[PDB]
Design a protein around this motif. Structure first.
Motif, mmCIF file in Angstrom:
data_model
loop_
_atom_site.group_PDB
_atom_site.id
_atom_site.type_symbol
_atom_site.label_atom_id
_atom_site.label_comp_id
_atom_site.label_asym_id
_atom_site.label_seq_id
_atom_site.Cartn_x
_atom_site.Cartn_y
_atom_site.Cartn_z
ATOM 1 N N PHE A 161 6.898 1.084 3.777
ATOM 2 C CA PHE A 161 5.842 1.065 4.874
ATOM 3 C C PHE A 161 4.697 1.345 4.145
ATOM 4 O O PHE A 161 4.666 2.626 3.406
ATOM 5 C CB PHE A 161 6.241 2.082 6.069
ATOM 6 C CG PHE A 161 5.004 1.860 6.962
ATOM 7 C CD1 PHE A 161 5.176 0.969 7.966
ATOM 8 C CD2 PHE A 161 4.133 2.912 6.896
ATOM 9 C CE1 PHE A 161 4.032 1.112 8.913
ATOM 10 C CE2 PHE A 161 2.795 2.722 7.677
ATOM 11 C CZ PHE A 161 2.856 1.867 8.946
ATOM 12 N N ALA A 162 3.819 0.642 3.994
ATOM 13 C CA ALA A 162 2.372 0.796 3.286
ATOM 14 C C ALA A 162 1.382 0.070 4.294
ATOM 15 O O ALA A 162 1.569 -0.703 5.030
ATOM 16 C CB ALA A 162 2.565 0.439 1.943
ATOM 17 N N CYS A 163 0.212 0.789 3.903
ATOM 18 C CA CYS A 163 -0.822 0.032 4.495
ATOM 19 C C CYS A 163 -2.315 -0.370 3.690
ATOM 20 O O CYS A 163 -2.329 0.090 2.376
ATOM 21 C CB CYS A 163 -1.772 1.108 5.468
ATOM 22 S SG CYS A 163 -0.432 1.636 6.896
ATOM 23 N N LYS A 164 -3.232 -1.100 3.959
ATOM 24 C CA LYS A 164 -4.443 -1.435 3.351
ATOM 25 C C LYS A 164 -5.426 -1.643 4.211
ATOM 26 O O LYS A 164 -5.418 -2.045 5.264
ATOM 27 C CB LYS A 164 -4.271 -2.380 2.376
ATOM 28 C CG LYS A 164 -3.911 -3.780 3.142
ATOM 29 C CD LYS A 164 -3.860 -4.995 1.986
ATOM 30 C CE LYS A 164 -3.956 -6.307 2.626
ATOM 31 N NZ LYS A 164 -3.764 -7.505 1.650
ATOM 32 N N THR A 165 -6.779 -1.551 3.515
ATOM 33 C CA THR A 165 -7.763 -1.762 4.333
ATOM 34 C C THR A 165 -8.404 -3.043 4.032
ATOM 35 O O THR A 165 -8.271 -3.891 3.039
ATOM 36 C CB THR A 165 -9.103 -0.726 4.092
ATOM 37 O OG1 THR A 165 -9.646 -0.905 2.776
ATOM 38 C CG2 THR A 165 -8.593 0.704 4.398
ATOM 39 N N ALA A 166 -9.693 -3.557 5.004
ATOM 40 C CA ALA A 166 -10.037 -4.805 4.746
ATOM 41 C C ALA A 166 -10.725 -4.875 3.218
ATOM 42 O O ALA A 166 -11.081 -6.271 2.809
ATOM 43 C CB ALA A 166 -11.074 -4.925 5.915
ATOM 44 N N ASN A 167 -11.352 -3.752 2.705
ATOM 45 C CA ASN A 167 -12.038 -3.973 1.318
ATOM 46 C C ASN A 167 -10.891 -3.643 0.320
ATOM 47 O O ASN A 167 -11.516 -3.958 -0.845
ATOM 48 C CB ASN A 167 -13.158 -2.793 1.570
ATOM 49 C CG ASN A 167 -12.637 -1.502 0.969
ATOM 50 O OD1 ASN A 167 -11.336 -1.238 0.658
ATOM 51 N ND2 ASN A 167 -13.521 -0.606 0.601
ATOM 52 N N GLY A 168 -9.760 -3.645 0.497
ATOM 53 C CA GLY A 168 -8.633 -4.163 -0.334
ATOM 54 C C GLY A 168 -7.933 -2.356 -1.017
ATOM 55 O O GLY A 168 -7.312 -2.332 -1.657
ATOM 56 N N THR A 169 -8.467 -1.296 -0.372
ATOM 57 C CA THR A 169 -7.974 0.034 -0.552
ATOM 58 C C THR A 169 -6.584 0.186 0.174
ATOM 59 O O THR A 169 -6.355 0.074 1.263
ATOM 60 C CB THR A 169 -8.927 1.258 -0.018
ATOM 61 O OG1 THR A 169 -10.171 0.834 -0.366
ATOM 62 C CG2 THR A 169 -8.411 2.372 -0.451
ATOM 63 N N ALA A 170 -5.634 0.622 -0.709
ATOM 64 C CA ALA A 170 -4.290 0.698 -0.381
ATOM 65 C C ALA A 170 -4.020 2.297 0.058
ATOM 66 O O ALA A 170 -4.481 2.841 -0.750
ATOM 67 C CB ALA A 170 -3.133 0.265 -1.422
ATOM 68 N N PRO A 206 -0.053 4.127 -0.354
ATOM 69 C CA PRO A 206 1.202 3.474 -0.601
ATOM 70 C C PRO A 206 2.305 4.266 0.281
ATOM 71 O O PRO A 206 1.937 5.093 1.149
ATOM 72 C CB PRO A 206 1.324 3.901 -1.814
ATOM 73 C CG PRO A 206 0.559 5.344 -1.920
ATOM 74 C CD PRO A 206 -0.736 4.954 -1.126
ATOM 75 N N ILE A 207 3.469 3.752 -0.053
ATOM 76 C CA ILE A 207 4.715 4.560 0.572
ATOM 77 C C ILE A 207 4.640 6.043 0.412
ATOM 78 O O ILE A 207 3.947 6.494 -0.816
ATOM 79 C CB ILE A 207 6.117 3.929 -0.113
ATOM 80 C CG1 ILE A 207 6.200 2.729 0.398
ATOM 81 C CG2 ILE A 207 7.118 4.911 0.210
ATOM 82 C CD1 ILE A 207 7.330 1.943 -0.433
ATOM 83 N N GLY A 208 4.955 6.531 1.599
ATOM 84 C CA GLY A 208 4.682 8.229 1.395
ATOM 85 C C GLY A 208 3.564 8.750 1.935
ATOM 86 O O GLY A 208 3.275 9.976 2.239
ATOM 87 N N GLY A 209 2.451 7.760 2.320
ATOM 88 C CA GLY A 209 1.242 8.080 2.848
ATOM 89 C C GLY A 209 0.192 8.557 1.774
ATOM 90 O O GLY A 209 0.222 8.495 0.583
ATOM 91 N N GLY A 210 -0.933 9.150 2.473
ATOM 92 C CA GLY A 210 -2.065 9.419 1.535
ATOM 93 C C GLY A 210 -3.310 9.336 2.530
ATOM 94 O O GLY A 210 -3.327 9.207 3.652
#
Ligand SMILES: CN1CCN(c2c(Nc3ccc(O[C@H]4O[C@H](CO)[C@@H](O)[C@H](O)[C@@H]4O)c(Cl)c3)c(=O)c2=O)CC1
Length: 158
Positions: free
Chosen positions: A1-10, A12-16
């Motif tokens: 599971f990982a996420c990213k923003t519309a401007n390309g900032t990720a 990663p797995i494990g959060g942040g």
């Protein structure tokens, strides 16, 4: 599971954490809602959908800056509305695809008091939104922290 923003900032797995700069209606009148739609700005996916189901909540939402000072409102998560700033953790949403889908969060903010000044300052922190992710496979419990910044000034005319 990982996420990213519309401007390309990720994140990663494990959060942040990531900074999200939101486009805001530059003029919001008394009695109108300022809509801050994060579902167009924040996307996540499941990295092993054939085997694992991911669960995602809005764990907490906090207001800062001009939003905290000058607006009052609610947060909509996945079709349901809740107090903002939040006072509980929402129900969980299932993520079951490697294909990115929106994090379905939006703020609906009404002006409280104005004398025509700057209500929200460009570049200022206006919200912190915490996404909590778990699953049906192991003990993972991860926080994805979205620091929300105004991309532009907002004025409430009087
Ligand atoms: C076809 N091949 C695919 C890869 N593969 C395997 C795995 N892959 C795998 C990938 C990511 C995993 O964890 C992360 O992603 C999960 C799904 O979003 C989240 O819930 C987690 O919290 C975490 O963010 C985990 Cl536990 C496992 C195995 O295990 C395994 O065998 C071998 C078979």
């Amino acid at each position: 599971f990982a996420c990213k923003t519309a401007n390309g900032t990720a994140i990663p797995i494990g959060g942040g954490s990531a900074n999200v700069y939101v486009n805001l209606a530059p003029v919001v009148n008394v009695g109108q809602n300022l809509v801050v739609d994060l579902s167009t700005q924040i996307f996540c996916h499941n990295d092993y959908p054939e085997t694992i189901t991911d669960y995602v909540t809005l764990q907490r939402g906090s207001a800062y800056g001009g939003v905290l000072s000058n607006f009052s409102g609610t947060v909509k998560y996945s079709g349901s509305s809740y107090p903002f700033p939040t006072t509980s953790e929402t129900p969980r949403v299932v993520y079951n695809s490697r294909t990115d889908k929106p994090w379905p969060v939006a703020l609906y903010l009404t002006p409280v008091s104005s004398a025509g000044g700057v209500a929200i300052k460009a570049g200022s922190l206006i919200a912190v939104l915490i996404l909590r992710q778990t699953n049906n496979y192991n003990s993972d419990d991860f926080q994805f922290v979205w620091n929300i910044y105004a991309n532009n000034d907002v004025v409430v005319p009087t």
